[PDB]
Amino acid sequence: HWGYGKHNGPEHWHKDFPIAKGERQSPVDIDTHTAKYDPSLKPLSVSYDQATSLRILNNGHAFNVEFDDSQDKAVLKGGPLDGTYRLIQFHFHWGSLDGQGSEHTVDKKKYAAELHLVHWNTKYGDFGKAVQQPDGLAVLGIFLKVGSAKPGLQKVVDVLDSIKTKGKSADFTNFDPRGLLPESLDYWTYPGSLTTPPLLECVTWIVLKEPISVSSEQVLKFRKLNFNGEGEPEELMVDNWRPAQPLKNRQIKASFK
Ligand SMILES: COc1ccc(C(=O)C(O)(O)C(F)(F)F)cc1
Numbered sequence: 303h304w305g306y307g308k309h310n311g312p313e314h315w316h317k318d319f320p321i322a323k324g325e326r327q328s329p330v331d332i333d334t335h336t337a338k339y340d341p342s343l344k345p346l347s348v349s350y351d352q353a354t355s356l357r358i359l360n361n362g363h364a365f366n367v368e369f370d371d372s373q374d375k376a377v378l379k380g381g382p383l384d385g386t387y388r389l390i391q392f393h394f395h396w397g398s399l400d401g402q403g404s405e406h407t408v409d410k411k412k413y414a415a416e417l418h419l420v421h422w423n424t425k426y427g428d429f430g431k432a433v434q435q436p437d438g439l440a441v442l443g444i445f446l447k448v449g450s451a452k453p454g455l456q457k458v459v460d461v462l463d464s465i466k467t468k469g470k471s472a473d474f475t476n477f478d479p480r481g482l483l484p485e486s487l488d489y490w491t492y493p494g495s496l497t498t499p500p501l502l503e504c505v506t507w508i509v510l511k512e513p514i515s516v517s518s519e520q521v522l523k524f525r526k527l528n529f530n531g532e533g534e535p536e537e538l539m540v541d542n543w544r545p546a547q548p549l550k551n552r553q554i555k556a557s558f559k
């Protein structure tokens with residue numbers, strides 16, 4: 303099926319998913335001098351105090367930390383958003399090398415990885431209905447650079463051994479996603495899509511200006527994961543990122559000057 307390899311990667315997706323060539327595809331390059339400061343954007347409201355993590359899953363192209371989204375426990379509000387978006391999961395995209403890995407780029411700069419905290423619009427009842435709507439998802443994107451370790455990431459790092467291959471999951475309770483945030487919530491925002499198939503154009507992207515730092519040791523443990531299932535030939539889970547797509551008729555807005 304689809305993947306990130308030579309023969310099934312981003313340049314092939316349009317054959318099964320024609321929206322790959324659509325008008326609001328993600329990710330994009332964030333040109334910081336062309337993005338417009340909008341003083342009518344509110345501050346982001348990240349309310350994760352009551353978040354309930356449940357499990358961590360290797361789904362064959364990332365690892366997802368999944369949350370209980372049956373109540374308003376961990377919600378995103380404010381910023382460019384109308385209404386309330388519930389946290390369902392977060393995951394990362396990363397490279398085979400420190401100089402690549404992020405999906406979004408900032409003046410063509412690639413970060414070593416990118417964190418996606420995925421939220422769905424409560425007005426649509428559940429995630430599956432939300433992805434069918436132009437304003438169904440809000441994804442908080444956070445760049446990772448390599449330097450100092452991120453203490454709040456280490457618990458994630460230490461469980462990756464137990465979900466090395468596709469389809470493996472592990473209990474993963476009492477994880478606080480607030481430990482993955484930078485100090486500043488300054489952000490860029492633009493309307494976009496899922497960055498993996500089905501590539502639905504359902505996402506309000508909110509990309510934080512300030513990266514978090516992770517250690518070389520932490521990112522190396524991401525790269526020990528496998529795209530394949532157990533007992534299948536070992537293909538390291540690396541470079542699970544889609545390149546920047548054409549901006550077309552879209553304007554990136556900044557919450558800061
Ligand atoms: C079906 O479940 C997912 C579908 C698509 C995605 C993505 O394409 C994404 O990782 O870009 C994001 F969620 F950030 F939009 C993630 C989960």
Ligand SMILES: [Zn+2]
Pocket residue numbers: 393394395418497
């Ligand atoms: Zn993602």
